[PDB]
Structure 1
């Protein structure tokens, strides 16, 4: 299928336990009408590496922004307001979004506001006719065994905030 979008993002690793330290890894993300997939990026050869994951688009229930971390490390700090900077676009990833599906949320960090907007728009387009789209979501991260937004301790808990 034709690639709609291809980007390098920071993906948050699946937090195994409420005590497991959070890991963030750079991945190459591809979107088609059928799948959202992510790979290791082979920087030396300038191409995608091994596949790390794949989400069938029909399984996605929600795609929205996430409230950013309160005290992020410099790699994820939102810059002040004010052409593409080659280094910052592959080193700094301040803008998170979430992809909710059967196997909970996937958290992805974009280097720019515009790129995050592009992905959210295209994902909303490809999921438009899905059968299990939710009318509610969690605006905050699932962190250390609970949602920051509502303190619910189940990853599959119904969203606490109605989508406008």
Structure 2
């Protein structure tokens, strides 16, 4: 696999451990045909750091936008550009795979749109793409959209494409 894309995004903790707090971390994301991985970004060194997470491309069932946070904190609100682009991430999309939704934030709409599009392309021949989905965040216990109670609850909404 060669790198399809590469960007720096903010991403919310997946809280796969009961202990994990709910938090956001900046990460460098790489997209190949087989995986969507993310890493610590070594800023000084100007490089990729330690791998923090991964998702097998074929286990993704749904990549979509998400309903924006009610009151983004600065960090996620809407040429200080050079800096704003790696400090402000206000455009969320979601990557849904077996475990649930991975929440990613783009510092821009274009970047965001760019990412979804290659994402779609990559999973296009998957076998479990779902045609139902949640346009919002799962949080504090439930899917803000359908109000359901399980990260893995069926999409309360329709996706055709």
Q: Shorter-chain TM-score category?
A: over 0.9
Evaluate the alpha carbon distance shift between residue 128 and residue 84 of structure 1 in structure 2; reply closer, same or farther with a 3 A threshold. Answer: farther
Q: Secondary structure at the match of 1:25?
A: strand
Q: Secondary structure at the match of 2:118?
A: helix
Instruction: Work out whether residues 26 and 40 of structure 1, in 8 Å CA contact, stay in contact via their aligned partners in 2.
Output: yes
Instruction: Work out whether residues 99 and 106 of structure 1, in 8 Å CA contact, stay in contact via their aligned partners in 2.
Output: yes
How many angstroms apart in 2 are the aligned matches of 1:115 and 1:154?
29
When the two chains are superposed, the root-mean-square deviation of aligned CA atoms in Å is 1.8
How many angstroms apart in 1 are the aligned matches of 2:40 and 2:18?
26
Q: 1:12 deviation in Å?
A: 0.2
How many angstroms apart in 2 are the aligned matches of 1:144 and 1:18?
13
Evaluate the alpha carbon distance shift between residue 17 and residue 51 of structure 1 in structure 2; reply closer, same or farther with a 3 A threshold. Answer: closer
Q: 1:22 deviation in Å?
A: 2.2
How many angstroms apart in 1 are the aligned matches of 2:32 and 2:16?
29
Q: Which has the higher contact order (CA 8 A, sep 6+)?
A: 1
Evaluate the alpha carbon distance shift between residue 146 and residue 35 of structure 1 in structure 2; reply closer, same or farther with a 3 A threshold. Answer: same
Q: 1:150 deviation in Å?
A: 1.0
* Worse-matched range after superposition: 86-95 or 21-30: 21-30
2:110 equivalent among 97, 109, 114? 114
> Which runs of 5 or more residues in structure 1 are unaligned?
none
Q: Secondary structure at the match of 1:3?
A: coil
Instruction: Work out whether residues 7 and 28 of structure 1, in 8 Å CA contact, stay in contact via their aligned partners in 2.
Output: yes
Residue 143 of structure 1 pairs with residue 139 of structure 2:
yes
Instruction: Work out whether residues 62 and 96 of structure 2, in 8 Å CA contact, stay in contact via their aligned partners in 1.
Output: yes
Q: Secondary structure at the match of 1:45?
A: coil
Q: 1:15 deviation in Å?
A: 3.6
TM-score, scaled to structure 2: 0.94
> Which runs of 5 or more residues in structure 2 are unaligned?
none
TM-score, scaled to structure 1: 0.92
Evaluate the alpha carbon distance shift between residue 17 and residue 3 of structure 1 in structure 2; reply closer, same or farther with a 3 A threshold. Answer: closer
Could you report, residue by residue, the CA deviation over 1:109-164 in whole angstroms, capped at 9, with x for unpaired residues?
00000000000000000000000000010000001010000110011111001114
